[PDB]
Every structure is written in structure tokens, then in C-alpha cells.
């Protein structure tokens, strides 16, 4: 504990993410909405926005 701040301990956690190629398993807190068809709508499919 007497060393300089460059020589002090540092706990590192690396969170690595996989982009969507498989079915989505982990997804954040957003509510679902009923599906509507044959209308010009702004959709959102697992982060796919259009």
C-alpha cells in the first residue's frame, strides 16, 4: 500500500458482447408490443430498428 498510484492494484472486469447472429437470449428491459401487419409502422426487432 506504500507504492505510488501507478503501482497500485486495479481490478479489471471485461464484459465481452456477441452481436446478433444466433437467437437472442440476453436482452434488456423493454416492454413488448402486439404485432400489427399491412401498415406502415416503425418496428424494433431485438435492436433492429427500421
Amino acid at each position: 500500500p506504500t507504492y505510488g498510484v501507478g503501482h497500485q492494484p486495479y481490478r479489471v472486469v471485461v464484459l465481452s458482447f456477441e452481436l446478433l447472429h444466433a437467437p437472442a437470449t440476453v436482452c434488456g428491459p423493454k416492454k413488448s408490443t402486439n404485432l400489427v401487419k399491412n401498415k406502415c409502422v416503425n418496428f424494433n426487432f431485438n435492436g433492429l430498428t427500421g
Binding site: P1, T2, Q8, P9, R11, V12, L15, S16, F17, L19
Partner: peptide, 18 residues
């Protein structure tokens, strides 16, 4: 081509001994 985040914090209180 790494994607993700790196979280590093100082731990001189718990990982240091005299």
C-alpha cells in the same frame, strides 16, 4: 475486432498488505 467494455477500478484497500 473486439466489442464490449473494460471496467477498471483501484483496489488498494483490499488487495494490498504491508
Amino acid at each position: 475486432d473486439f466489442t464490449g467494455c473494460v471496467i477498471a477500478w483501484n483496489s488498494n484497500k483490499l488487495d494490498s498488505k504491508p
